[PDB]
Amino acid sequence: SNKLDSKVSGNYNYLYRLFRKSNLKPFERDISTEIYQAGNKPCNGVAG
Amino acid sequence: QCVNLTTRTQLPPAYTNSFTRGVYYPDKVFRSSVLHSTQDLFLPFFSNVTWFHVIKRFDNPVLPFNDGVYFASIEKSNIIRGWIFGTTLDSKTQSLLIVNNATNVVIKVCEFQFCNDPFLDMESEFRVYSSANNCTFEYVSQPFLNFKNLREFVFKNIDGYFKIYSKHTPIDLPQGFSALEPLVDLPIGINITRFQTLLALHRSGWTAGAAAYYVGYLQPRTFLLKYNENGTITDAVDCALDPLSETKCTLKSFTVEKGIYQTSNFRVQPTESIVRFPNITNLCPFDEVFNATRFASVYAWNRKRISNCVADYSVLYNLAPFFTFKCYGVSPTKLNDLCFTNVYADSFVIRGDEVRQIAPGQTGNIADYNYKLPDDFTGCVIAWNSNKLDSKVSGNYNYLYRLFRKSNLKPFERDISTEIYQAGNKPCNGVAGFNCYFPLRSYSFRPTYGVGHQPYRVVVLSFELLHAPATVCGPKKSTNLVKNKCVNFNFNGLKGTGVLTESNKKFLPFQQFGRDIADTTDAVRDPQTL
Amino acid sequence: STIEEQAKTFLDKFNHEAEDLFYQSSLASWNYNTNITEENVQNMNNAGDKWSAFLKEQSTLAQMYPLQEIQNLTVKLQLQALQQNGSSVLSEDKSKRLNTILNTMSTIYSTGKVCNPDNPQECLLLEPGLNEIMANSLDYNERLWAWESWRSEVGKQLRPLYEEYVVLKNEMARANHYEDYGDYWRGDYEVNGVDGYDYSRGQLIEDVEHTFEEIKPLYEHLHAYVRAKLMNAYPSYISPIGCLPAHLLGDMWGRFWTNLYSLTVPFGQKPNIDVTDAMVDQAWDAQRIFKEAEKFFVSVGLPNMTQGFWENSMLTDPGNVQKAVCHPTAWDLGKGDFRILMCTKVTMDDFLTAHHEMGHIQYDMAYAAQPFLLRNGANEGFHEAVGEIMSLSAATPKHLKSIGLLSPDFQEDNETEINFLLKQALTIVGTLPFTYMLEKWRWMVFKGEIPKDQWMKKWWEMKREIVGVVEPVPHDETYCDPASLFHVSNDYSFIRYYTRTLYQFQFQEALCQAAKHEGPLHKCDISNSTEAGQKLFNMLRLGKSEPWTLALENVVGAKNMNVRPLLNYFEPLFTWLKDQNKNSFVGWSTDWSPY
Ligand SMILES: *[C@@H]1O[C@H](CO)[C@@H](O)[C@H](O)[C@H]1NC(C)=O
Ligand SMILES: *[C@@H]1O[C@H](CO)[C@@H](O)[C@H](O)[C@H]1NC(C)=O
Ligand SMILES: *[C@@H]1O[C@H](CO)[C@@H](O)[C@H](O)[C@H]1NC(C)=O
Ligand SMILES: *[C@@H]1O[C@H](CO)[C@@H](O)[C@H](O)[C@H]1NC(C)=O
Ligand SMILES: *[C@@H]1O[C@H](CO)[C@@H](O)[C@H](O)[C@H]1NC(C)=O
Ligand SMILES: *[C@@H]1O[C@H](CO)[C@@H](O)[C@H](O)[C@H]1NC(C)=O
Ligand SMILES: *[C@@H]1O[C@H](CO)[C@@H](O)[C@H](O)[C@H]1NC(C)=O
Ligand SMILES: *[C@@H]1O[C@H](CO)[C@@H](O)[C@H](O)[C@H]1NC(C)=O
């Protein structure tokens, strides 16, 4: 759908999740937006 | 709106015998005069089932869901109403709701703010949640409905499907057998770990009539179902209850003649999962890349290829002074387990304001003329403050950059030309005259600058994979070897199951794993400890 | 392969190689100014020689391609500024004399000392001692004696000096394809090649006259009230119809009328808006004085300070052993270094000056993305005006209440607004007739319109008509009164203050309209207004890349000079002047009736 899903400046209407603590079950949907944690230091709502 | 209820009576949870309740028709197919065996999630026979009673008793706690739930309600006048499901039971995550009002049955799947004490109130009131923003699934159907009413339900959450079964029976749990029939399937596709119940309060300030409901938990096991000549399940056998029932489940019959029979075998199932790999040696030399005494200029960026070693990216990630760790096209977490053929360490020093130019699709003096990053760049960039090292009070002129070129530099291309740049009509001929200057300028740093102009030591890691065997691997964590217990071992890619114990065998030094007469791996040598 | 691409490749290399040397020139100048020592003097001299020669060595290597074939506006603007001959168009002998003539006026002024005859045991310098007696003494003859004695000695030793100055300066401008040296200063506002925003150098003189025709009615009422107030101080020595004596303006040149607040106080019984006692009571050190400003500058939307600024800038006097220059100056050292040189005191004025100098710094990194040669204000008026506007907001009592300097229970009665407006009228409205007359006089002496033997007579007759100030005694051509000023004697532009005055109120109104203020301009503040900063930031970031007319239109909506904001600011005071000027006569007469 290059004609309809491409913007010259860039289409940002489509999002994909990159980080999660575990893999989803088959046909399972996740919509949580909480900040992913990668280190021992807790996020505490900080995207640092 | 939420109303807090404080007329509760505190009591530990009661228990009672499940007997032989909780068997549902496993499929949609008619069968008659056939003893059929099924393997699914079932409620074990004669198991502990939690007992709740409401009367001044008020029971509405939060119960785990686990794999399934068998719900019963020995009831009169139908105080019990519905159910709640979810993982956090608030609008942080999606939640399910089921209600059975006096007119119909309502099922909603929306992201509710559930109250602390949801309940109902003839019925002339409603207090369950306060808000519901994103609603996905809705449904309506017919109402489901000395104690006389006995309801039984089964809830399962497999592959996003919410299976519900039901059965009514006019009448502790009774001593009898009656199968459950499928009711409704819902493709909710959510995660469920806890569930609630919904009660309608009677006001005469509120008075609760005598009601009791029981909660079980389903487990995966095999049953043997008998169908009468009319296709109705009349008897069942739990294949894992006691040795006698195991014989019936193996003989595929309900009466066992005198004798001796061989049912199943004894299994001391495992416990751990021990993975072992050799000691962490031959580390990739990343110290001289970041702990270097001198860093190359941005225009003449030093390129370091890394091969034939194990790459410990966790060390770099664990240093606080590396403030900016920006990685594009690959997850920083999976840098360890992922394997690459060659890693290119691209070290340089720039000013504070040009750090953003070190990224694919960026422009500027560095991006176009010093260091260009391809759009499909796989790797991370690391930046850290270097005012204490790359600044002199008189001025650190040791760093130079390239500013002019006939075109933007190609990705991963280094230019060190010193010929006087030619631009237009009149040739420069190597003379620093009008419209003809040197193609290189010098970064001159001082320790008196702010965060936006201080010299920053930035090294870019270029990740590539080639036809050659990728010999740059991450560390492979080795759990402490478990012994004298069945465990799922994985030694150097040799996978299997069994109890790992001590050995008196005298392996030869070159021998790694031993085999038996059966040509199966019986002895193995740990790589951490030989 | 085109000649325009040659210009593209000539500027960025020149800009950065200047930045490496401009900082060293600035740092050595900063190092000299932070602790004066003999080695710091020669490092500035070595850097100054290197910096001056570096521009000159590229000046020879920047003037052999025509500029009519280059289309990029920023690139063409950069090359025009670099191609400017300056002192390089004269021969070596003439240039060696012109600089010495410039030098010999500075050393005479710097060492200018006037002392009483028959008392030569010690004498008094102008800046340290003569400035003190200039506004605090209330004696007619003693102040007249200093006014006459300074100009008599200084005029005799600068009149021959300025005669060589004007002829040599005029020759260089003609050698630079300019009509006069006054047009050379007018060339800073020159805009070429831009449609709609084009400006003419010769248009500035009539634009100044057009702007001043509305300044005069406001000034005449201000002049009449001052004359009426000074009539009480001096009963019979000032005529009700004539002009004010030249030695009674609060300063020797009459530039600033701020010294006349005690002389011309409307309501002396009421307390002032000064809250300096709160500063010392709460121990507001210079570190937190600037930190209070930093809270204010981020409230409007401008960025905060960096780590380099706080560590290196000195905000307090170092001490006796460490001698430093105490003049408040904002240093754009380049390469992202911005320092404020101030021996700050815990006072209201230094708090106001702290905003002014940081606003100068806040201007500097706004165009940090611009090329180094374009790293300047579009004209010499924006750079000072953007610093003046923020001191206007810092003086508002609402700001003082917000930062706790002023008690919330204080009442802003009508009188304290009248008194505050009069003080701002003295510093702004009073200086404009003096700001215009000096530049207008200098514009003609470079033109040659004034006869060479009629310089001083032309000087006096217009000052009576423009500033409304009469000379004590007629001055012959043997003296040179105009050259006694700091700006004229050191070859410093003076029209910058006239444009800064107009831009200050134009910017203030534009910020206030953006901030959605429901009151007058004097009570207006830009605190807690997000949109004010971004509207302000548009011209700050452009720098000299875009024409000053374009930058003005982005803020006030008009490319040309506007005076309406100035009269609106003083409108409550302007009406107050009219009410109390019924007894006095508005305006003056050119006659010498007073003296
Ligand atoms: C119920 O649990 C108790 C304690 O956990 C245990 O003693 C009892 O045997 C259990 N009942 C059944 C039927 O397993
Ligand atoms: C099956 O149904 C018939 C007639 O409805 C009835 O006579 C018979 O008893 C039923 N079988 C069983 C096992 O109940
Ligand atoms: C005093 O001046 C000298 C002159 O070189 C300078 O090196 C020194 O840093 C100054 N003192 C201080 C405290 O800065
Ligand atoms: C000309 O070049 C300058 C860079 O020095 C750029 O900012 C400007 O936008 C260019 N103008 C045109 C019309 O290309
Ligand atoms: C500067 O002086 C040189 C030498 O006379 C001259 O060629 C050049 O045109 C002058 N610069 C300008 C901008 O006219
Ligand atoms: C300026 O603001 C930025 C972000 O708002 C902050 O990181 C920095 O620390 C601030 N500077 C100071 C000196 O507080
Ligand atoms: C200020 O305004 C008030 C309001 O009526 C008035 O009573 C007072 O006379 C005014 N004072 C001056 C000095 O204008
Ligand atoms: C402006 O914002 C600052 C920052 O919080 C605040 O302290 C101050 O009170 C605000 N101004 C007013 C008038 O409320």
Side-chain angles (χ1 to χ4, degrees):
Chain A
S1 64
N2 205 4
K3 317 310 154 289
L4 308 173
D5 294 340
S6 303
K7 289 182 54 60
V8 56
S9 65
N11 201 355
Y12 294 150
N13 293 140
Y14 303 130
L15 277 296
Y16 80 108
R17 181 179 314 266
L18 188 46
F19 292 164
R20 209 179 95 83
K21 273 72 151 167
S22 54
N23 299 19
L24 304 89
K25 301 288 97 176
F27 296 139
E28 183 59 34
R29 195 205 293 105
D30 55 354
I31 59 172
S32 72
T33 64
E34 199 269 331
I35 309 290
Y36 173 74
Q37 177 70 60
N40 46 40
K41 180 255 297 179
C43 279
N44 299 72
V46 175
Chain B
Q1 61 178 357
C2 310
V3 163
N4 295 111
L5 311 186
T6 55
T7 61
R8 261 204 193 91
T9 295
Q10 288 74 237
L11 199 70
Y15 286 77
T16 177
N17 209 17
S18 162
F19 299 118
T20 48
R21 314 217 90 77
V23 170
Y24 53 90
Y25 285 78
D27 189 358
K28 303 306 294 271
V29 173
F30 179 89
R31 286 180 189 99
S32 84
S33 298
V34 171
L35 279 77
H36 190 254
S37 171
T38 61
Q39 208 276 0
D40 192 42
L41 299 156
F42 281 94
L43 180 78
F45 281 3
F46 298 110
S47 71
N48 269 323
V49 56
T50 312
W51 186 352
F52 291 92
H53 197 75
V54 167
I55 179 65
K56 195 131 180 196
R57 290 292 287 154
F58 188 74
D59 288 332
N60 189 351
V62 178
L63 306 92
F65 193 73
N66 282 341
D67 306 334
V69 159
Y70 159 84
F71 199 100
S73 304
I74 297 169
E75 189 70 36
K76 48 153 180 166
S77 73
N78 292 318
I79 297 89
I80 203 70
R81 275 296 93 82
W83 294 272
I84 304 188
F85 296 87
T87 50
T88 69
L89 300 190
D90 61 359
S91 298
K92 277 74 176 174
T93 62
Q94 189 71 215
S95 305
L96 189 151
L97 159 68
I98 293 168
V99 184
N100 164 30
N101 61 6
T103 61
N104 44 310
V105 165
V106 176
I107 297 86
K108 305 211 319 181
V109 178
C110 193
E111 192 175 5
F112 301 103
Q113 288 293 108
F114 285 118
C115 281
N116 303 337
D117 202 323
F119 67 96
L120 276 297
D121 287 319
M122 301 95 88
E123 179 182 0
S124 300
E125 211 159 1
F126 171 89
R127 289 189 180 91
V128 170
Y129 66 97
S130 63
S131 77
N133 55 2
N134 310 337
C135 302
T136 303
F137 185 109
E138 270 85 1
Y139 182 76
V140 175
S141 182
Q142 177 95 329
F144 292 160
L145 322 175
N146 195 2
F147 291 103
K148 297 299 194 53
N149 284 4
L150 198 157
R151 281 86 169 96
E152 281 174 283
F153 293 79
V154 165
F155 318 132
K156 295 201 300 184
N157 191 357
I158 302 299
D159 209 335
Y161 293 10
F162 202 75
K163 270 82 68 177
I164 299 191
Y165 305 79
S166 296
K167 162 65 73 171
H168 295 285
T169 302
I171 52 167
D172 206 3
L173 276 171
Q175 197 75 250
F177 181 59
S178 287
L180 272 64
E181 291 146 55
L183 193 65
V184 164
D185 190 357
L186 303 178
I188 62 170
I190 79 167
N191 194 7
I192 287 175
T193 48
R194 313 190 270 142
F195 88 101
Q196 306 308 115
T197 187
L198 301 178
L199 282 72
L201 308 189
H202 292 340
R203 313 267 183 166
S204 61
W206 64 86
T207 314
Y213 66 93
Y214 313 81
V215 170
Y217 283 80
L218 307 184
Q219 316 217 351
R221 64 179 62 251
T222 311
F223 281 24
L224 191 82
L225 314 164
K226 148 180 293 170
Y227 294 84
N228 61 351
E229 73 276 23
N230 301 9
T232 310
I233 295 179
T234 56
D235 280 323
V237 175
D238 190 359
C239 194
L241 175 66
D242 49 354
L244 171 59
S245 300
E246 193 151 4
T247 312
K248 294 168 170 177
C249 171
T250 303
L251 291 186
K252 300 292 189 290
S253 174
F254 269 57
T255 61
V256 170
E257 273 296 354
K258 178 186 65 166
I260 173 168
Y261 311 87
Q262 302 155 20
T263 63
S264 186
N265 130 88
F266 191 74
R267 278 312 163 90
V268 183
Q269 301 298 352
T271 308
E272 294 88 6
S273 162
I274 300 299
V275 292
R276 302 276 270 193
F277 281 85
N279 281 316
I280 309 293
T281 57
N282 191 4
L283 276 297
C284 285
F286 276 60
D287 186 278
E288 85 267 13
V289 185
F290 289 178
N291 296 13
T293 59
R294 184 76 277 159
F295 274 90
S297 299
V298 55
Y299 86 100
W301 54 286
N302 260 332
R303 158 152 271 190
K304 178 97 208 82
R305 58 169 295 106
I306 286 145
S307 57
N308 43 292
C309 51
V310 62
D312 62 358
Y313 311 93
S314 305
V315 176
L316 310 183
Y317 176 74
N318 281 355
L319 270 295
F322 305 148
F323 279 18
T324 300
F325 177 67
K326 202 57 66 180
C327 203
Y328 280 14
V330 63
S331 172
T333 65
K334 73 179 183 68
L335 296 176
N336 286 257
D337 57 355
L338 188 58
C339 180
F340 283 103
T341 294
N342 283 314
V343 169
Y344 292 133
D346 303 333
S347 89
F348 48 89
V349 174
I350 58 172
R351 296 189 289 117
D353 279 332
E354 296 150 277
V355 175
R356 60 97 180 173
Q357 299 174 356
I358 310 291
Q362 289 289 337
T363 186
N365 310 317
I366 310 303
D368 305 332
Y369 300 97
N370 291 270
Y371 192 74
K372 173 70 152 306
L373 275 182
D375 292 321
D376 52 358
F377 162 61
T378 64
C380 318
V381 307
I382 305 172
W384 60 88
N385 188 282
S386 66
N387 193 42
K388 328 296 295 187
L389 293 176
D390 302 344
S391 289
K392 313 162 46 69
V393 59
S394 65
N396 209 359
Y397 316 94
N398 290 319
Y399 292 115
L400 281 73
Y401 72 97
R402 166 163 311 276
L403 194 39
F404 276 117
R405 182 172 169 78
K406 50 185 172 293
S407 65
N408 297 359
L409 266 180
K410 292 183 183 291
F412 304 126
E413 186 185 27
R414 186 206 288 100
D415 208 315
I416 53 176
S417 181
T418 67
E419 191 264 343
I420 304 282
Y421 186 74
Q422 187 53 64
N425 305 322
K426 308 270 155 290
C428 297
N429 279 70
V431 176
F434 190 17
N435 287 347
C436 292
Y437 287 167
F438 202 67
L440 289 163
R441 296 295 87 193
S442 187
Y443 279 159
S444 52
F445 292 114
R446 272 80 65 189
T448 68
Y449 287 0
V451 70
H453 288 251
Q454 263 178 12
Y456 291 164
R457 291 174 162 196
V458 184
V459 186
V460 177
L461 296 171
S462 174
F463 292 166
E464 63 163 8
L465 267 163
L466 294 171
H467 57 90
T471 186
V472 179
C473 306
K476 293 176 176 180
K477 311 304 163 49
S478 293
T479 305
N480 179 10
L481 172 62
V482 157
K483 190 177 62 59
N484 302 170
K485 246 277 68 190
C486 189
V487 292
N488 291 287
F489 57 86
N490 194 337
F491 296 170
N492 296 295
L494 164 76
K495 314 172 141 73
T497 318
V499 167
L500 318 180
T501 61
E502 67 90 21
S503 177
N504 298 112
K505 305 179 178 185
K506 282 186 293 292
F507 272 38
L508 282 72
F510 54 89
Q511 276 164 341
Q512 273 315 85
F513 58 95
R515 292 179 181 176
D516 60 346
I517 295 90
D519 201 284
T520 68
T521 79
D522 65 328
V524 75
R525 172 177 281 175
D526 192 291
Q528 302 301 40
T529 54
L530 311 193
Chain C
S1 189
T2 188
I3 191 178
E4 208 279 328
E5 281 299 331
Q6 291 181 356
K8 298 297 292 295
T9 58
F10 173 76
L11 289 175
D12 278 342
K13 290 298 176 181
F14 179 68
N15 282 325
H16 177 94
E17 80 182 1
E19 287 156 7
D20 295 338
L21 304 184
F22 174 68
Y23 181 88
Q24 290 176 208
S25 163
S26 288
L27 177 77
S29 295
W30 171 273
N31 290 338
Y32 160 78
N33 280 266
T34 188
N35 193 40
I36 301 173
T37 317
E38 179 45 46
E39 61 271 16
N40 285 349
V41 173
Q42 49 91 30
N43 298 125
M44 181 156 68
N45 295 0
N46 293 318
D49 177 33
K50 172 252 295 177
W51 178 245
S52 61
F54 156 69
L55 272 74
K56 292 290 111 174
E57 80 160 354
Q58 306 304 326
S59 171
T60 302
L61 297 171
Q63 304 158 352
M64 61 79 71
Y65 286 117
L67 272 295
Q68 69 248 20
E69 184 65 26
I70 301 168
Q71 293 54 240
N72 288 72
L73 175 64
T74 65
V75 171
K76 182 174 180 179
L77 266 181
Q78 289 184 58
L79 287 180
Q80 262 179 6
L82 179 53
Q83 277 203 359
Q84 279 173 340
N85 292 114
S87 58
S88 87
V89 73
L90 273 299
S91 73
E92 201 58 1
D93 179 34
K94 298 317 283 175
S95 298
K96 182 181 183 291
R97 184 67 180 273
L98 182 57
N99 204 17
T100 313
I101 291 172
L102 287 190
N103 274 357
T104 192
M105 294 182 286
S106 295
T107 180
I108 278 171
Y109 184 20
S110 179
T111 61
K113 39 192 291 291
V114 167
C115 46
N116 209 311
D118 281 325
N119 288 293
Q121 62 274 15
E122 72 267 12
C123 295
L124 198 65
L125 294 174
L126 183 81
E127 175 68 52
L130 272 297
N131 275 16
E132 296 294 324
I133 210 167
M134 192 95 66
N136 301 265
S137 178
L138 266 297
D139 199 25
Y140 187 91
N141 58 294
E142 187 180 7
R143 174 167 162 83
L144 182 63
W145 171 77
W147 191 89
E148 288 283 332
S149 58
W150 165 268
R151 265 84 179 284
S152 164
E153 301 181 0
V154 161
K156 287 192 290 289
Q157 70 190 355
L158 291 177
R159 172 68 185 243
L161 268 61
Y162 208 78
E163 287 298 325
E164 294 293 328
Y165 171 82
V166 62
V167 294
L168 287 195
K169 281 294 190 183
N170 201 358
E171 279 288 328
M172 158 263 288
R174 294 207 280 96
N176 203 3
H177 307 116
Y178 283 101
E179 53 186 6
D180 52 61
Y181 183 74
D183 194 75
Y184 188 89
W185 279 332
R186 287 189 295 259
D188 197 73
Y189 303 89
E190 182 211 323
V191 171
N192 268 1
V194 189
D195 301 326
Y197 315 86
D198 179 83
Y199 203 83
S200 170
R201 297 155 293 182
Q203 200 169 1
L204 194 66
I205 53 165
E206 54 250 32
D207 285 331
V208 163
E209 209 66 14
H210 206 302
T211 51
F212 189 69
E213 68 191 80
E214 299 100 357
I215 299 294
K216 209 186 168 193
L218 280 73
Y219 177 70
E220 266 170 340
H221 302 97
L222 174 71
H223 186 262
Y225 181 76
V226 174
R227 191 214 289 148
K229 270 298 185 177
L230 294 178
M231 181 165 328
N232 295 128
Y234 323 107
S236 62
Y237 271 14
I238 312 167
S239 177
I241 195 70
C243 295
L244 190 70
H247 62 288
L248 297 180
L249 277 297
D251 270 332
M252 72 195 98
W253 312 278
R255 171 172 157 78
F256 281 129
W257 290 11
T258 62
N259 290 321
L260 286 77
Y261 183 38
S262 63
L263 295 175
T264 66
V265 65
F267 303 96
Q269 194 273 334
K270 285 313 287 171
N272 204 359
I273 319 173
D274 303 352
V275 287
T276 304
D277 63 358
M279 269 153 179
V280 299
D281 281 331
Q282 302 173 31
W284 279 35
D285 56 356
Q287 174 82 14
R288 199 187 173 279
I289 284 287
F290 279 89
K291 277 292 182 184
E292 281 296 328
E294 197 192 33
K295 272 155 47 178
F296 161 73
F297 290 104
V298 305
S299 86
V300 66
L302 290 182
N304 64 7
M305 295 298 102
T306 68
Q307 61 184 356
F309 159 71
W310 292 114
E311 295 171 341
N312 306 116
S313 296
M314 49 82 88
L315 310 176
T316 316
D317 188 271
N320 192 1
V321 64
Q322 178 174 338
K323 62 194 297 292
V325 181
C326 56
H327 182 272
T329 308
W331 288 72
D332 183 6
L333 297 206
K335 271 286 196 51
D337 197 5
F338 313 97
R339 303 177 211 188
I340 293 173
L341 169 68
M342 289 175 28
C343 289
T344 317
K345 295 300 190 299
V346 194
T347 52
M348 201 75 228
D349 179 76
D350 276 27
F351 174 78
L352 297 195
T353 317
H355 284 72
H356 195 280
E357 297 291 337
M358 185 179 288
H360 277 311
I361 286 301
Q362 280 276 11
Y363 193 73
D364 295 340
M365 73 291 291
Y367 55 77
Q370 293 293 327
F372 170 81
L373 190 153
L374 279 180
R375 276 184 205 167
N376 295 111
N379 60 6
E380 63 183 1
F382 292 166
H383 197 275
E384 297 280 347
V386 300
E388 290 278 346
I389 55 173
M390 326 173 90
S391 170
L392 267 185
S393 302
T396 67
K398 186 155 47 183
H399 180 200
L400 312 183
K401 292 181 296 205
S402 166
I403 60 188
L405 280 176
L406 190 57
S407 69
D409 300 333
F410 176 71
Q411 290 301 317
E412 276 69 20
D413 59 356
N414 186 7
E415 309 187 355
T416 199
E417 298 183 3
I418 286 304
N419 300 301
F420 166 65
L421 274 183
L422 204 70
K423 298 185 287 182
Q424 308 282 94
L426 297 172
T427 186
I428 283 154
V429 187
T431 193
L432 289 189
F434 183 74
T435 303
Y436 155 67
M437 61 79 71
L438 181 62
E439 267 297 274
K440 188 257 286 183
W441 180 81
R442 279 207 295 193
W443 281 328
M444 294 182 286
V445 301
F446 299 146
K447 202 63 175 176
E449 302 179 359
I450 303 171
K452 305 317 258 175
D453 288 330
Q454 295 289 106
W455 270 28
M456 181 95 78
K457 263 75 69 176
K458 198 64 181 283
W459 195 68
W460 281 126
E461 77 195 282
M462 61 155 168
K463 182 191 265 282
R464 292 149 165 239
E465 194 266 329
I466 298 161
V467 186
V469 175
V470 69
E471 55 262 46
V473 290
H475 284 289
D476 63 358
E477 71 96 20
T478 73
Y479 301 167
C480 185
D481 284 334
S484 62
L485 190 45
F486 182 76
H487 306 91
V488 58
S489 84
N490 292 315
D491 189 37
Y492 269 105
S493 199
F494 205 71
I495 197 63
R496 51 178 57 249
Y497 293 99
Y498 199 88
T499 57
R500 168 217 84 172
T501 291
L502 267 70
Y503 294 147
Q504 174 204 116
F505 292 112
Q506 275 183 253
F507 293 163
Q508 182 84 343
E509 270 203 352
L511 288 197
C512 288
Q513 297 292 337
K516 325 199 163 196
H517 188 253
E518 300 85 6
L521 196 65
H522 72 304
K523 197 44 62 175
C524 171
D525 210 318
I526 59 170
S527 306
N528 306 101
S529 179
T530 318
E531 47 267 58
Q534 286 70 240
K535 291 202 181 180
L536 197 64
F537 190 75
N538 263 359
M539 66 182 179
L540 270 68
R541 189 260 188 273
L542 288 177
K544 222 170 194 165
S545 71
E546 291 318 299
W548 62 266
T549 52
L550 176 45
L552 205 60
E553 193 147 319
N554 278 10
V555 188
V556 299
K559 59 94 183 172
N560 209 7
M561 311 325 278
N562 203 19
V563 178
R564 314 291 71 51
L566 192 150
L567 60 85
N568 191 359
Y569 182 87
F570 292 107
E571 183 269 336
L573 189 77
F574 193 27
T575 60
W576 171 90
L577 294 172
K578 288 182 179 294
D579 300 357
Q580 287 191 358
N581 278 330
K582 182 50 68 193
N583 268 15
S584 70
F585 177 73
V586 61
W588 54 77
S589 183
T590 56
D591 270 339
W592 67 285
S593 178
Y595 188 27

